[PDB]
Amino acid sequence: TTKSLLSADEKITESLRSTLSDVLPDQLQTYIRTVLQFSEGANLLTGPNTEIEFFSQDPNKNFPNIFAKYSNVLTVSSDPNFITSEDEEVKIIWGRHGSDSLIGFDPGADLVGKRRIDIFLGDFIDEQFNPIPGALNAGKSWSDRFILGDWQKPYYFEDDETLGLNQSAMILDFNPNEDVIQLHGDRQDYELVNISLGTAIFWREKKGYDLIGVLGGVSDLSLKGDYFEFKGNTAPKTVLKTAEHIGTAANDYIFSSTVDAKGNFYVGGGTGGSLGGRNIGARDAWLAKYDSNGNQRWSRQFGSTGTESLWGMASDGSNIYVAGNTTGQLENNTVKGGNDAYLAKYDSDGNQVWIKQNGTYTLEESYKITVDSSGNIYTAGHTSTDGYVAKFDSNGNQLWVAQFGTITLDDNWGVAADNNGNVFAGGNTKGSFGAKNTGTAGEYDAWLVKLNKDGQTDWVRQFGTPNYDFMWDIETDSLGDIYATGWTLGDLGGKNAGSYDVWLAKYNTNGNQLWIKQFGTSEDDAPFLDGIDIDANDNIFLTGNTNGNLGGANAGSYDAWAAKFDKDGNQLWLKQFGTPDYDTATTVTAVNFGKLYVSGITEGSLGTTNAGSYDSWALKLDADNGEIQDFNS
Ligand SMILES: [Ca+2]
Ligand SMILES: [Ca+2]
Ligand SMILES: [Ca+2]
Ligand SMILES: [Ca+2]
Ligand SMILES: [Ca+2]
Ligand SMILES: [Ca+2]
Ligand SMILES: [Ca+2]
Ligand SMILES: [Ca+2]
Ligand SMILES: [Ca+2]
Ligand SMILES: [Ca+2]
Ligand SMILES: [Ca+2]
Ligand SMILES: [Cl-]
Ligand SMILES: [Mg+2]
Ligand SMILES: [Mg+2]
């Protein structure tokens, strides 16, 4: 009846207004009210109008620090939400450019009775906010996928006698001509309701209704549309039974890998579940050790009630150093800043020997670590954002920190030591750091820096197209030359095949650019995270994702790929592997006896049946030809 639909509208409005107004800080409420006033839904946010601050001496009172706590801001790439964590009641998940795979909910977390609203911006690209005209990417949009369930269960589902308004998605830029909403089960399990805000997606069974999502500003949709993807209620069929499978009912990620001098292989990343130990809260960091024959020796999980990940790991040959960021307190003499870099040392028996956290209110991210042949440790990251490199000794004493960059945004996506006391860093900049940027609207270029043993700058170099270029990872070869891998939307190493393409750049120790190779399909091709490794014979290995037919026929959605190059940039092989669902590689580690490990993440069943949402996997390849071996061979 009319009065049932009117009651639903009222109860949805009142519930969202209550949750949003109680959870979002006043400064964020004020910004969102002003946008909505330009474009009535300002009435969901009842907080007082508050001056928005950028120049407080207290980083915490500044809009960027407040915004960071309630946001996942992804990249110009086609991203999975690799920073998802159940640490806030309300979160803004912002895909930016690229065909993003957006999740905010962890179906393996204990969320009983908790309020959860995830606000999704599929695109909302930088150029929509930037008033300068004629940007290359002005008015561009991508096919985003909003994940509101999987094969296991619907997300935001309270399964109770209420309308289920305590947990819901809110998607603000859904375009039914382009985007996809992913749901548990099949279309007969849902009802769409026209509401003031746009469209309500209700789960419906005999027992009752539960609000799963609200689609802002869109009406008169159908559950028969191509823009709804239904996952059913059974785990996908297992492929690649040769892989090592790592998964809980929660979101589980491998982000990095390494090897020790005995051939033991290590993996690590973040989990929303109890993977290496009992979950401490939200996402935790984890790592695991395998012997040279594929046998798991131990797993460790550490963290806070906040969010942390292992983003990088490296070995001095016996110990394993791990790095990342935390929103909590990992070191018990540290005053946490809520967004801090950490470094820790594990022994080969899985004892956390020490941990160091940079407790400052300054926002800090750190994705990269390396160890030199003297056993000193280098981390890199960013804190406008500026890059840094930090050097530590094996007892975790800081030897120096180098900070550098431009007046605009610089990020770090690489650190690598040579044999000779020098360290390289690399990353992305909107500015003119080592060259004048050809982008007319602050599109990223790639940069490289060489620091000496004292942390002084030997040189800076910059390369790019006028479009976005994005570096993900760097590594040195045995001669001390520096290699970088990334994606480009332009013609960097050659004519762009379409959309994102892969590049591999080499510089010598003196800063001369030797070559840039580019390869790809007409579709999206990119390395990702820990995307380059170089073995003792100076063979280069690259890894990432593609939604094209890059190494082979595409299995479905994005797949993983791996490639081998020689030190002159000749392609020796390129292999593609995956499931019918979303997959990406995240890391590659060469070992010896011609063995290579590629590891990553998946929404499908890779190695064994999917345990829930994201699972992880590790694949052993033959380095001669890319052929997949049994992990246990
Ligand atoms: Ca993106
Ligand atoms: Ca997007
Ligand atoms: Ca989109
Ligand atoms: Ca709900
Ligand atoms: Ca945690
Ligand atoms: Ca901090
Ligand atoms: Ca800067
Ligand atoms: Ca560029
Ligand atoms: Ca391409
Ligand atoms: Ca796939
Ligand atoms: Ca999982
Ligand atoms: Cl970015
Ligand atoms: Mg955040
Ligand atoms: Mg690497």
XYZ file of C-alpha atoms and ligand atoms in Angstrom:
647
model
C 0.000 0.000 0.000
C 0.796 3.691 -0.320
C 1.142 3.957 3.510
C 3.718 1.103 3.672
C 5.970 2.829 1.056
C 5.472 6.159 2.905
C 6.426 4.502 6.248
C 9.588 3.004 4.612
C 10.679 6.390 3.205
C 10.232 8.023 6.621
C 12.079 5.254 8.534
C 15.013 5.206 6.003
C 15.350 8.994 6.100
C 15.216 9.125 9.931
C 17.704 6.197 10.334
C 20.305 7.555 7.832
C 19.926 11.099 9.342
C 20.499 9.749 12.863
C 23.581 7.626 11.972
C 25.254 10.146 9.606
C 24.630 13.119 11.969
C 25.941 11.259 15.077
C 29.069 9.730 13.417
C 30.394 12.303 10.875
C 32.413 15.147 12.405
C 30.861 18.652 11.970
C 33.593 19.797 9.489
C 32.775 16.915 7.132
C 28.998 17.513 7.562
C 29.550 21.209 6.603
C 31.481 20.396 3.316
C 28.820 17.843 2.194
C 25.896 20.228 3.016
C 27.519 22.944 0.791
C 27.855 20.570 -2.247
C 24.255 19.370 -1.842
C 23.017 23.020 -1.547
C 24.691 23.746 -4.930
C 23.236 20.597 -6.714
C 17.734 19.020 0.095
C 19.604 15.836 1.215
C 21.621 18.363 3.311
C 18.671 17.595 5.734
C 20.233 14.140 6.543
C 23.135 16.051 8.247
C 21.910 17.929 11.351
C 25.304 18.909 12.864
C 26.107 22.635 13.274
C 27.908 24.571 10.505
C 31.602 24.523 11.434
C 34.583 26.303 9.878
C 36.711 23.837 7.814
C 40.395 24.152 8.869
C 43.616 23.309 6.974
C 46.298 25.330 8.870
C 45.763 24.346 12.532
C 49.137 23.639 14.347
C 47.225 20.534 15.623
C 47.115 18.139 12.568
C 43.941 16.542 14.194
C 41.798 19.693 13.803
C 42.626 19.859 10.082
C 40.088 18.628 7.529
C 42.625 16.222 5.872
C 43.210 14.341 9.191
C 39.428 14.236 9.946
C 38.606 13.182 6.339
C 41.290 10.448 6.458
C 39.720 8.802 9.480
C 36.297 8.373 7.667
C 37.554 7.556 4.135
C 39.159 4.981 1.870
C 40.634 7.109 -0.973
C 41.755 4.781 -3.804
C 44.005 5.506 -6.785
C 43.783 6.679 -10.410
C 44.110 2.922 -11.226
C 41.265 0.358 -11.625
C 41.450 -0.661 -7.915
C 40.089 -3.330 -5.708
C 39.436 -1.639 -2.271
C 42.844 -2.891 -0.964
C 42.549 -0.613 2.167
C 39.028 -1.848 3.327
C 38.779 -2.378 7.129
C 35.821 -2.496 9.549
C 37.124 0.290 11.825
C 34.370 2.960 11.569
C 30.552 3.041 11.652
C 30.429 5.405 8.604
C 33.051 5.287 5.802
C 33.379 7.089 2.442
C 34.824 4.742 -0.182
C 36.124 6.819 -3.097
C 37.260 4.942 -6.252
C 38.495 7.902 -8.309
C 39.496 7.118 -11.900
C 39.492 3.551 -13.176
C 37.001 0.650 -13.142
C 37.045 0.074 -9.385
C 35.830 -3.007 -7.498
C 34.438 -1.339 -4.405
C 33.762 -3.183 -1.143
C 33.453 -1.664 2.311
C 31.769 -4.452 4.276
C 33.573 -7.494 5.761
C 31.114 -10.440 5.923
C 33.506 -12.278 8.240
C 33.738 -9.515 10.894
C 31.612 -9.548 14.125
C 29.316 -6.587 13.287
C 26.261 -7.787 15.291
C 24.355 -4.759 16.526
C 26.836 -2.302 14.974
C 25.762 0.688 12.808
C 27.409 0.498 9.370
C 26.944 2.903 6.464
C 29.409 2.722 3.575
C 29.095 5.717 1.250
C 30.413 4.828 -2.239
C 31.749 7.263 -4.823
C 32.642 5.100 -7.830
C 34.389 7.869 -9.740
C 34.042 11.477 -8.428
C 37.391 12.042 -10.179
C 39.788 14.877 -9.195
C 38.993 16.760 -12.427
C 35.231 17.089 -11.334
C 36.482 19.086 -8.196
C 39.286 20.922 -10.066
C 37.813 24.050 -11.712
C 40.626 24.491 -14.306
C 39.198 23.644 -17.794
C 40.349 21.302 -20.630
C 41.907 18.440 -18.531
C 42.595 15.258 -20.667
C 40.247 13.287 -18.312
C 37.442 15.949 -17.949
C 33.994 14.222 -17.963
C 35.512 10.699 -18.178
C 33.699 7.892 -16.349
C 34.532 4.234 -15.730
C 32.467 1.054 -15.132
C 32.560 0.691 -11.305
C 31.339 -2.407 -9.424
C 29.683 -1.853 -6.044
C 29.911 -5.052 -3.918
C 26.774 -5.479 -1.734
C 27.029 -9.275 -1.360
C 28.854 -12.406 -2.469
C 27.978 -16.120 -2.854
C 27.997 -16.498 0.930
C 25.515 -13.842 2.123
C 24.112 -10.361 1.466
C 26.153 -7.539 3.059
C 24.623 -4.985 5.474
C 22.169 -7.716 6.581
C 20.915 -7.643 10.201
C 18.407 -10.572 9.665
C 15.919 -9.337 12.328
C 12.370 -8.096 12.913
C 13.348 -4.438 11.880
C 13.569 -2.998 8.304
C 17.350 -3.557 8.731
C 18.274 0.144 8.653
C 21.217 -0.053 11.064
C 23.507 -1.298 8.226
C 23.277 -0.189 4.601
C 25.336 0.949 1.595
C 24.721 4.390 0.088
C 25.958 4.672 -3.502
C 26.057 8.280 -4.744
C 27.088 8.022 -8.426
C 25.538 4.801 -9.724
C 25.091 4.966 -13.567
C 22.923 2.010 -14.716
C 24.345 2.497 -18.288
C 27.901 1.693 -17.052
C 28.168 0.490 -13.431
C 27.311 -2.804 -11.740
C 25.773 -3.582 -8.358
C 26.788 -7.067 -7.150
C 24.307 -8.948 -4.948
C 24.040 -12.251 -3.011
C 21.483 -14.789 -4.301
C 19.176 -14.051 -7.237
C 16.728 -11.330 -8.338
C 13.764 -13.110 -6.619
C 15.500 -12.365 -3.252
C 15.128 -8.552 -3.635
C 12.584 -5.770 -3.965
C 13.409 -2.276 -5.249
C 11.504 0.593 -3.546
C 11.287 4.171 -4.910
C 12.238 6.498 -1.998
C 12.926 10.238 -1.681
C 16.672 9.599 -1.904
C 16.382 7.484 -5.045
C 16.113 3.664 -4.903
C 16.126 1.327 -1.877
C 17.428 -2.282 -2.420
C 15.674 -4.558 0.095
C 16.498 -8.156 0.785
C 13.140 -9.944 1.058
C 12.306 -13.414 2.459
C 9.167 -14.904 4.186
C 10.470 -13.667 7.602
C 10.734 -10.017 6.342
C 12.799 -7.218 4.693
C 16.322 -5.817 5.259
C 17.717 -2.662 3.642
C 20.953 -3.600 1.793
C 21.647 -0.320 -0.119
C 20.327 3.050 -1.237
C 21.129 4.322 -4.770
C 21.156 8.117 -4.533
C 19.372 10.079 -7.293
C 18.299 7.087 -9.457
C 14.690 5.771 -9.878
C 12.684 3.202 -11.909
C 15.353 0.497 -12.076
C 14.736 -3.218 -12.588
C 16.353 -6.250 -10.892
C 16.327 -7.669 -14.501
C 18.848 -4.947 -15.594
C 22.335 -5.921 -16.836
C 23.606 -3.519 -14.125
C 22.684 -6.071 -11.367
C 25.041 -9.057 -11.067
C 23.736 -11.928 -8.897
C 26.278 -14.327 -7.278
C 23.845 -17.034 -6.130
C 24.415 -18.900 -2.830
C 27.197 -21.479 -3.618
C 30.994 -20.953 -3.642
C 32.481 -20.836 -7.114
C 34.088 -23.902 -8.668
C 37.792 -24.265 -7.712
C 40.470 -23.650 -10.375
C 44.288 -23.753 -10.079
C 44.386 -26.491 -7.426
C 48.236 -26.190 -7.737
C 48.033 -22.905 -5.723
C 48.415 -22.455 -1.985
C 45.080 -21.045 -0.748
C 44.862 -18.648 2.213
C 41.388 -17.574 3.367
C 38.912 -16.959 6.154
C 35.273 -15.874 5.983
C 36.634 -12.271 6.130
C 38.545 -10.151 3.609
C 42.074 -11.702 3.381
C 44.956 -10.135 1.448
C 48.541 -10.977 0.521
C 50.367 -7.691 -0.256
C 54.030 -8.736 -0.091
C 56.406 -11.734 -0.124
C 60.087 -12.488 0.428
C 62.601 -15.345 0.710
C 65.406 -16.034 3.223
C 68.848 -17.518 2.576
C 67.545 -21.070 3.286
C 64.846 -20.812 0.573
C 61.952 -20.393 3.081
C 59.180 -18.368 1.375
C 57.178 -15.761 3.304
C 53.880 -14.013 2.514
C 51.909 -11.385 4.410
C 49.317 -8.620 4.178
C 46.068 -7.818 5.982
C 43.002 -9.715 7.159
C 39.573 -8.911 8.542
C 39.515 -12.386 10.060
C 41.405 -14.746 12.408
C 44.028 -15.947 9.915
C 47.413 -16.204 11.775
C 45.795 -15.692 15.215
C 42.634 -14.298 16.783
C 41.398 -11.073 15.125
C 42.272 -8.025 17.362
C 39.792 -5.727 15.582
C 39.022 -4.526 12.064
C 41.940 -5.412 9.717
C 45.139 -6.861 11.297
C 48.586 -7.433 9.799
C 49.725 -11.027 9.204
C 52.585 -13.056 7.740
C 53.372 -16.729 7.228
C 56.475 -18.831 6.644
C 56.691 -21.796 4.171
C 59.732 -24.068 3.862
C 61.405 -24.513 0.429
C 59.022 -27.511 -0.215
C 55.748 -25.527 0.239
C 55.032 -26.643 3.885
C 53.611 -23.935 6.134
C 55.817 -23.603 9.258
C 53.976 -20.787 11.115
C 51.571 -17.852 10.804
C 51.565 -14.674 12.897
C 48.924 -11.975 13.197
C 49.457 -8.673 15.043
C 47.671 -5.391 15.255
C 45.392 -3.104 17.271
C 41.587 -2.606 17.502
C 42.245 -0.204 14.569
C 43.533 -0.901 11.078
C 46.995 -2.116 9.997
C 48.492 -4.020 7.060
C 51.825 -5.576 6.182
C 52.574 -3.736 2.884
C 56.248 -4.783 2.475
C 58.599 -7.460 3.714
C 62.322 -8.190 3.127
C 64.990 -10.446 4.621
C 68.647 -9.951 5.696
C 68.926 -13.767 4.919
C 67.714 -14.962 8.333
C 65.390 -12.303 9.882
C 62.266 -10.888 8.149
C 61.574 -7.124 8.343
C 57.989 -6.049 7.753
C 56.549 -2.585 7.182
C 53.243 -0.866 6.843
C 50.842 1.554 8.466
C 48.498 1.512 11.473
C 45.644 3.608 12.819
C 46.292 2.114 16.262
C 49.205 1.725 18.671
C 51.576 -1.196 17.836
C 54.578 -0.082 19.972
C 53.711 0.380 23.711
C 55.980 3.439 24.266
C 54.428 5.297 21.269
C 51.832 8.100 21.280
C 49.864 6.972 18.199
C 48.872 9.551 15.552
C 46.029 7.485 14.016
C 47.860 7.115 10.647
C 51.414 6.019 11.327
C 54.192 4.006 9.604
C 55.638 0.986 11.498
C 58.604 -1.351 10.976
C 59.009 -4.700 12.800
C 61.634 -7.477 12.881
C 60.705 -11.177 12.960
C 63.183 -13.990 13.542
C 62.957 -17.204 11.448
C 60.978 -18.810 14.378
C 58.193 -16.157 14.135
C 59.196 -14.121 17.255
C 58.541 -10.377 16.948
C 62.010 -9.234 18.087
C 61.081 -5.512 18.019
C 58.641 -3.066 16.467
C 58.992 0.668 15.879
C 56.083 3.040 15.169
C 56.373 6.716 14.115
C 53.823 8.159 16.542
C 53.124 11.643 15.183
C 49.800 13.346 14.357
C 51.120 13.918 10.774
C 49.318 11.538 8.323
C 51.850 8.937 7.121
C 51.612 5.962 4.723
C 54.395 3.426 4.056
C 54.181 0.655 1.399
C 57.882 -0.248 0.786
C 60.896 -1.818 2.508
C 64.316 -3.138 1.439
C 67.392 -4.578 3.167
C 70.939 -3.959 1.871
C 73.903 -6.414 1.915
C 75.184 -4.845 5.209
C 71.792 -5.823 6.807
C 70.603 -2.160 7.190
C 66.870 -1.531 6.540
C 65.235 1.151 4.421
C 61.572 2.072 4.494
C 59.801 4.536 2.225
C 56.450 6.281 2.217
C 54.797 9.680 2.174
C 53.479 12.192 4.749
C 50.673 18.416 0.417
C 52.131 14.853 0.495
C 55.950 14.570 0.438
C 58.041 11.408 -0.010
C 60.474 10.027 2.550
C 63.126 7.354 2.884
C 64.150 6.194 6.422
C 67.256 4.075 7.224
C 67.490 1.826 10.317
C 70.084 -0.588 11.705
C 69.218 -4.219 12.642
C 68.324 -3.135 16.260
C 65.684 -0.686 14.861
C 67.717 2.476 15.605
C 66.919 5.154 13.029
C 70.097 6.282 11.226
C 68.416 9.067 9.149
C 65.193 10.193 7.422
C 65.225 11.998 4.074
C 62.104 13.974 3.179
C 61.691 15.440 -0.355
C 59.279 16.450 -3.096
C 57.266 19.303 -4.602
C 54.722 21.946 -3.415
C 52.009 19.491 -4.694
C 51.202 15.828 -4.079
C 54.158 13.387 -4.242
C 53.694 9.723 -3.159
C 56.223 6.911 -2.740
C 55.887 3.559 -4.565
C 59.371 2.180 -4.335
C 62.591 1.672 -2.425
C 65.637 -0.418 -3.468
C 69.250 -0.532 -2.296
C 72.298 -1.158 -4.519
C 75.406 -3.051 -3.401
C 77.316 0.237 -2.792
C 75.618 2.108 0.124
C 73.096 3.967 -2.146
C 69.291 3.644 -2.049
C 66.749 4.500 -4.711
C 63.188 5.686 -4.190
C 60.440 6.198 -6.692
C 56.852 7.249 -6.977
C 54.287 9.581 -8.514
C 53.986 13.358 -8.547
C 51.426 15.917 -9.714
C 54.285 18.441 -9.922
C 57.679 19.237 -11.460
C 60.173 17.360 -9.176
C 62.919 16.120 -11.563
C 61.482 17.726 -14.754
C 58.715 20.085 -15.890
C 55.495 18.002 -15.861
C 53.766 18.033 -19.347
C 50.346 17.369 -17.787
C 48.175 20.504 -18.262
C 45.977 19.577 -15.155
C 48.445 17.995 -12.639
C 48.271 14.461 -14.097
C 50.899 12.258 -12.431
C 54.391 11.605 -13.641
C 56.851 9.013 -12.324
C 59.939 10.168 -10.368
C 63.141 8.442 -9.159
C 65.668 9.660 -6.579
C 69.143 8.283 -5.748
C 70.271 8.849 -2.144
C 73.803 8.145 -0.881
C 74.713 6.308 2.351
C 74.110 9.586 4.306
C 70.625 10.167 2.898
C 71.754 13.047 0.646
C 70.275 13.384 -2.849
C 72.653 12.356 -5.687
C 69.930 13.056 -8.298
C 66.233 13.248 -9.132
C 64.717 12.135 -12.446
C 61.155 12.416 -13.764
C 59.462 10.758 -16.759
C 55.925 10.658 -18.023
C 53.320 11.345 -20.661
C 50.894 14.298 -20.497
C 48.326 11.805 -19.118
C 48.479 9.923 -15.793
C 51.481 7.593 -15.379
C 51.665 5.655 -12.139
C 54.680 3.794 -10.686
C 53.949 0.805 -8.406
C 57.385 -0.698 -7.578
C 61.205 -0.517 -8.152
C 64.196 -2.856 -7.825
C 67.926 -2.806 -8.502
C 69.979 -5.288 -10.568
C 73.429 -6.657 -9.664
C 75.135 -3.745 -11.560
C 73.216 -1.160 -9.418
C 70.909 -0.049 -12.236
C 67.354 0.866 -11.131
C 64.168 -0.518 -12.735
C 60.630 0.806 -12.243
C 57.260 -0.639 -13.256
C 53.859 1.027 -13.502
C 50.888 1.799 -15.752
C 50.262 4.636 -18.188
C 47.189 6.053 -19.943
C 49.622 7.549 -22.487
C 52.385 6.669 -24.939
C 55.353 6.251 -22.534
C 57.419 3.326 -23.967
C 55.407 3.020 -27.175
C 51.928 3.536 -28.686
C 49.197 2.887 -26.018
C 47.186 -0.285 -26.986
C 44.167 1.137 -25.110
C 43.222 2.218 -21.602
C 45.933 1.384 -18.994
C 49.138 -0.255 -20.316
C 52.166 -1.692 -18.465
C 55.574 -0.014 -18.589
C 59.071 -1.025 -17.404
C 61.743 1.692 -17.218
C 65.507 1.294 -16.622
C 67.894 4.044 -15.437
C 71.616 3.649 -14.791
C 73.304 4.580 -11.464
C 74.146 8.031 -13.023
C 70.530 8.934 -13.838
C 70.558 8.269 -17.575
C 67.298 6.812 -18.876
C 68.288 3.636 -20.776
C 64.864 2.558 -22.115
C 61.160 2.281 -21.376
C 59.182 -0.772 -22.594
C 55.391 -0.700 -22.810
C 52.947 -3.557 -23.390
C 49.270 -4.210 -23.105
C 45.919 -5.070 -24.615
C 43.143 -2.713 -25.681
C 41.764 -3.237 -22.149
C 43.172 -2.435 -18.685
C 46.701 -3.838 -17.978
C 48.801 -2.826 -14.965
C 51.379 -4.108 -12.507
C 50.198 -3.765 -8.862
C 51.755 -3.238 -5.404
C 54.934 -5.380 -5.106
C 55.029 -5.743 -8.891
C 58.777 -6.170 -9.714
C 61.523 -8.523 -8.553
C 65.035 -9.153 -9.892
C 66.801 -12.441 -9.300
C 70.561 -13.142 -8.849
C 70.921 -13.603 -12.673
C 69.357 -10.118 -13.375
C 66.135 -11.619 -14.834
C 63.270 -9.102 -14.211
C 59.828 -10.417 -13.128
C 56.687 -8.280 -13.249
C 53.188 -9.035 -11.976
C 49.710 -7.473 -11.726
C 46.215 -7.578 -13.260
C 44.476 -7.305 -16.641
C 40.863 -7.464 -17.826
C 42.108 -8.209 -21.343
C 43.583 -11.249 -23.103
C 47.192 -10.269 -22.210
C 49.003 -13.632 -21.686
C 46.079 -15.833 -22.720
C 42.299 -15.961 -22.855
C 40.785 -13.951 -19.947
C 39.028 -16.310 -17.409
C 36.581 -13.532 -16.349
C 36.740 -10.016 -14.827
C 40.405 -9.112 -13.987
C 42.991 -11.905 -13.990
C 46.558 -12.071 -12.671
C 49.539 -11.961 -15.027
C 53.261 -12.388 -14.640
C 56.108 -11.697 -17.097
C 59.839 -12.260 -17.324
C 62.226 -9.773 -19.020
C 66.004 -9.782 -19.445
C 68.088 -6.787 -18.258
C 67.808 -5.185 -21.746
C 64.007 -5.271 -21.677
C 63.432 -8.220 -24.043
C 60.210 -10.069 -23.022
C 61.003 -13.763 -22.398
C 57.460 -14.908 -21.401
C 54.079 -13.496 -20.285
C 51.580 -15.749 -18.460
C 47.994 -15.047 -17.414
C 46.036 -16.999 -14.794
C 42.961 -16.609 -12.689
C 39.382 -17.448 -11.973
C 36.107 -16.360 -13.610
C 35.859 -13.794 -10.768
C 38.124 -10.826 -9.901
C 41.829 -11.699 -9.389
C 45.020 -9.647 -9.180
C 48.575 -10.523 -8.394
C 50.112 -8.341 -5.655
C 53.657 -9.659 -5.275
C 56.439 -11.634 -6.971
C 59.499 -13.183 -5.338
C 62.215 -15.068 -7.284
C 63.981 -17.887 -5.358
C 66.612 -20.267 -6.846
C 66.508 -23.618 -8.799
C 64.465 -21.637 -11.418
C 61.397 -21.248 -8.997
C 59.352 -18.015 -8.892
C 56.404 -17.283 -6.530
C 53.539 -15.015 -7.649
C 50.928 -14.298 -4.997
C 47.737 -12.272 -4.851
C 44.061 -11.943 -4.129
C 40.790 -13.229 -5.511
C 37.018 -13.158 -5.185
C 36.903 -16.641 -6.747
C 38.036 -20.130 -5.693
C 41.767 -20.286 -6.466
C 43.606 -23.264 -4.962
C 40.497 -24.391 -3.071
C 36.953 -23.220 -2.355
C 36.547 -19.486 -1.588
C 36.162 -19.165 2.262
C 34.325 -15.810 1.922
C 34.742 -12.504 0.032
C 38.449 -11.899 -0.711
C 40.867 -14.807 -0.338
C 44.553 -14.983 -1.161
C 46.756 -17.399 -3.085
C 50.400 -18.198 -3.890
C 51.499 -19.865 -7.152
C 54.892 -21.508 -7.828
C 56.031 -20.967 -11.441
C 58.966 -22.343 -13.359
C 61.086 -19.208 -14.056
C 62.251 -20.640 -17.460
C 58.813 -20.593 -19.135
C 56.172 -19.359 -16.597
C 54.557 -22.854 -16.260
C 52.604 -23.347 -13.037
C 54.071 -26.050 -10.725
C 52.390 -27.682 -7.697
C 53.078 -25.420 -4.661
C 53.869 -28.660 -2.770
C 56.377 -30.075 -5.423
Ca 40.518 3.992 -8.887
Ca 36.149 4.618 -10.554
Ca 31.636 4.781 -12.648
Ca 20.531 -3.619 6.476
Ca 43.377 -4.402 13.707
Ca 50.733 9.754 11.916
Ca 54.734 17.450 -2.027
Ca 52.150 12.078 -16.721
Ca 45.866 -1.607 -22.220
Ca 39.555 -13.425 -13.231
Ca 38.205 -14.561 2.735
Cl 46.387 7.908 -6.839
Mg 41.314 6.322 5.871
Mg 59.361 -5.868 -5.492
